[PDB]
Structure 1
Amino acid sequence: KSLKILFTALFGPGHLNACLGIGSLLRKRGHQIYFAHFPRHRATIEKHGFLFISLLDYAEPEFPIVDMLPDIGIIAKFAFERMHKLTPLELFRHASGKHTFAGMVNGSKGENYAMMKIVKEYKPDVCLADYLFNMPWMFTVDCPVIPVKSVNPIELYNGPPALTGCSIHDPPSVREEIEQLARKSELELESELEKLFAHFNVPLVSYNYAQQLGIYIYPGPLDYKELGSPKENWVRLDSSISNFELPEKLKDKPGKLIYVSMGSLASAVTELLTMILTPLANSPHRFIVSTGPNGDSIKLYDNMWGDKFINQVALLPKVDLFITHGGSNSLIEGLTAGKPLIAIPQFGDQLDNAQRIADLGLGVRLNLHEFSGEKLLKAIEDVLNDEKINANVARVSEELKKSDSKDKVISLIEKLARDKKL
């Protein structure tokens, strides 16, 4: 029999790709797939055969949602300046109790009211939501609700705090301070969540509590098995996820083929791509560059080719290296295709992804704070001729191909939708 399945996710970006991915698996099984989101992403959602519902059309009049949406361009421009200037520890000191995304919590009241009305009218059999924190609607609606996590999942364990970029090699004494700062700002998030939940008259829960089922997307071979098991009811999905013609300009240029992409959001800060691409001019290699929304004003040299948006998943099998911001989706796409990574983390959970790449010998972390031409060129030389990095990367690529976590997770989704229990 057929299920009505409702997806939602935060405004943006990055929280749709995993939802769209689970979405497709479920569509193939003959389920009616709804997606409550924003007009701005209606095309991507409808192109996957899903039914679009504008969150904005189900707003309560006091909370029209658009008033309270974050200026995530402003936050990213600010994040770049601070990440250029500051060590991780200085970043957490200069934040001064302010949490990476707790400012977004008070703002989410309108989204909560809309999801409340949308579930009530459309009566889904199950909801899935990719948020940075749990919302009260997820515990009031008359169907089961599955939190979907695409961020680095270190937050699902009783280990070092998320957002720190802690290495497994970092001795306790070295991380003590940054982790105190990280736990302090975690309590500002609990404190904001307490207010959001009290407003809706809903018993407070942890921001990443899963009542019945939670799905985190992360490769098994990167998952934090050294920290034991994730929080109650969280299940791992290893990955959610045409052709590519190589540019004429890079034909008959020396070296291997390197993809550069700092993601849609950090790329909008032109200074970021300019300080990466400037030294790569004299790197004896060919670069395809995702130049971002303001890519028109990015200087590309004779050894590079760029477009604002690239078919990343089609490109990746062809390259020998990926210079990434360390977003979870870029990491998994990269590893699926068996390509090593240079991670230059820009924000939040990317610090954890960057350090996971380096710790597991999948590539290198190169922070904006310690960044130089010479260091980027040497990292490129090192990762391209490190036989052990290639072997670890090939190992993850095979595991990601060989997964039945897709079948297991679909089944748990369907079972939960049907029985209202697992």
Structure 2
Amino acid sequence: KSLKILFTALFGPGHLNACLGIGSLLRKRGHQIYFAHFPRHRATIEKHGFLFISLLDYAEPEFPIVDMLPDIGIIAKFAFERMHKLTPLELFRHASGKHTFAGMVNGSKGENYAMMKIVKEYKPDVCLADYLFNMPWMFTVDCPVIPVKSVNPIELYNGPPALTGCSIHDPPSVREEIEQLARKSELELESELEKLFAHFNVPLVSYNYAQQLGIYIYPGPLDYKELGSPKENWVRLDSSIRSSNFELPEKLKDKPGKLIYVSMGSLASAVTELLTMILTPLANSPHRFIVSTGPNGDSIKLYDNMWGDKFINQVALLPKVDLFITHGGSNSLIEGLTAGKPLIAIPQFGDQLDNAQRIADLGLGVRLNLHEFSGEKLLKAIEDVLNDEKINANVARVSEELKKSDSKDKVISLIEKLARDKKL
């Protein structure tokens, strides 16, 4: 029996891209996939064979729906300026118990109204949604809803607080304070969600509760097995890659060195100062760089050893590079490791700090922090990682694991079962 499956996600292309991958698996099984998201992604969604639904067409008049990607960058400038000078601890101190994505909770009412209307009209058998936190509609619509998580999944475990970037090597005395601050700001997230749920008259749940089934996308070899098991009803999908041939810019043909990809993500690349800071020293690195220059890419200066465009084909490119300098977004991490490339992660915000530290902790690359950044340090990191026989072997081992994953079969079966039975 072929199902009607409805997806949605946050604005961020990181979240959209994770769901595209799951959607593709379900489409292959014979299901009709709908995806409710913003008009800028209609092409990718429809190219995947999914029916596009504009959340903008379902908005209530008193509660409009910004697609925030254009507004982000204005926000991200402030974030960059703080972390570039403050240590993570000082950042948490300066935050004064303000949570990372709490300010986003209030603004989510409009998207909630839209989803209630969409689900009522389209009457799917099941929904999947990739958000930073649970939303009231997920508990009021008349079908099972599965949260999809693509951020670092330490939040699903009972060990160190998420978003702090703690290392397995940090001793008790060092984490005590950052863990107090993290726990304090978690209370702000709860109080913000209380207001949102109260608005819609829905009983409050944990921000990462999965009623029946939740799917987190993270490579099994990097998952937090040393913390036991994730929260109830959460199941791991080892990767989610949406899924062709790529040709190398002639600029970089017959230049010396390895090929290195630089991308600071979809969100953070908006901030031109960040890329400028990073690329400046790389002019003197004896290698060839392909750069994702972001929305404001045209005014970024590139050197003789660099070719860039606003938006690059990351999945096509990665097999052809030797190293990936990344902000440490989850998707980028999964794509880089699938391709078997080592990582230099320069975390900017949120879960990236957790991913960056996990890369370091498991010998898959190095973390560099903004606050102590130097061109000397970066160039050395490049040479070190390129010639570190241990890191490359670890990456090759994880790369092999990721390719042979059969997590998809189990997860699909669960999705199908839940849709049909309405329970378990």
In the alignment, the residues of structure 1 paired with residue 63 and residue 130 of structure 2 have an alpha-carbon distance, to the nearest angstrom, of 21
The Cα shift of 1:244 comes to 1.3
In the alignment, the residues of structure 2 paired with residue 65 and residue 190 of structure 1 have an alpha-carbon distance, to the nearest angstrom, of 23
The Cα shift of 1:181 comes to 0.9
2:216 aligns to what SS in structure 1?
Answer: strand
In the alignment, the residues of structure 2 paired with residue 390 and residue 66 of structure 1 have an alpha-carbon distance, to the nearest angstrom, of 43
The Cα shift of 1:68 comes to 8.9
Counterpart of 2:35 in structure 1 is: 35
* Per-residue Cα deviation, 1:30-67 (whole angstroms, up to 9, x for no partner): 11100111112222211211101111111122212239
* Per-residue Cα deviation, 1:217-275 (whole angstroms, up to 9, x for no partner): 00000000011000000000000111111111111111111100001221121111111
1:342 aligns to what SS in structure 2?
Answer: strand
In the alignment, the residues of structure 2 paired with residue 190 and residue 13 of structure 1 have an alpha-carbon distance, to the nearest angstrom, of 26
* Per-residue Cα deviation, 1:369-418 (whole angstroms, up to 9, x for no partner): 11000100000011000000011101110110011101111111111111
In the alignment, the residues of structure 2 paired with residue 68 and residue 363 of structure 1 have an alpha-carbon distance, to the nearest angstrom, of 32
**Ranges of 4+ aligned residues in structure 1 off by more than 6 Å:** 67-70
The Cα shift of 1:71 comes to 3.5
Question: How many matched pairs?
Answer: 422
The Cα shift of 1:192 comes to 0.5
The Cα shift of 1:111 comes to 0.9
Contact 2:261–2:324 (8 Å) recurs in 1: yes
TM-score scaled by structure 1?
A: 0.98
Pair 1:47-2:73 in alignment: no
Contact 1:22–1:240 (8 Å) recurs in 2: yes
Contact 1:328–1:350 (8 Å) recurs in 2: yes
The Cα shift of 1:13 comes to 3.6
1:203 aligns to what SS in structure 2?
Answer: coil
The Cα shift of 1:69 comes to 9.0
In the alignment, the residues of structure 1 paired with residue 64 and residue 293 of structure 2 have an alpha-carbon distance, to the nearest angstrom, of 33
The Cα shift of 1:83 comes to 1.2
The Cα shift of 1:98 comes to 1.0
Contact 2:217–2:236 (8 Å) recurs in 1: yes
Contact 1:342–1:364 (8 Å) recurs in 2: yes
Contact 2:213–2:235 (8 Å) recurs in 1: yes
The Cα shift of 1:70 comes to 9.3
In the alignment, the residues of structure 1 paired with residue 55 and residue 28 of structure 2 have an alpha-carbon distance, to the nearest angstrom, of 25
Contact 2:166–2:357 (8 Å) recurs in 1: yes
1:16 aligns to what SS in structure 2?
Answer: helix
Contact 1:70–1:104 (8 Å) recurs in 2: no
Contact 1:69–1:107 (8 Å) recurs in 2: no
Cα separation, partners in 2 of 1:81 and 1:68, compared to 1, 3 Å:
closer
Q: How does 1:81-92 map to 2 (within 5 A)?
A: 81-92=81-92
1:211 aligns to what SS in structure 2?
Answer: coil
Identity, % of aligned pairs?
A: 100
Q: How does 1:316-355 map to 2 (within 5 A)?
A: 316-355=318-357
Contact 2:6–2:127 (8 Å) recurs in 1: yes
Counterpart of 1:305 in structure 2 is: 307
1:264 aligns to what SS in structure 2?
Answer: coil
Contact 2:11–2:68 (8 Å) recurs in 1: no
Gaps of 5+ in 1: none
Contact 2:157–2:230 (8 Å) recurs in 1: yes
Contact 1:194–1:204 (8 Å) recurs in 2: yes
Contact 2:14–2:266 (8 Å) recurs in 1: no
* Per-residue Cα deviation, 1:332-387 (whole angstroms, up to 9, x for no partner): 00000000000001110000000000000000000111100010000001100000
Contact 1:334–1:341 (8 Å) recurs in 2: yes
* Per-residue Cα deviation, 1:108-145 (whole angstroms, up to 9, x for no partner): 11111111111111110000000000001111111000
Computed over aligned residues only, the root mean square deviation of the Cα atoms, in angstroms, reads 1.2
Contact 1:68–1:108 (8 Å) recurs in 2: no
Contact 1:254–1:285 (8 Å) recurs in 2: yes
In the alignment, the residues of structure 2 paired with residue 215 and residue 3 of structure 1 have an alpha-carbon distance, to the nearest angstrom, of 19
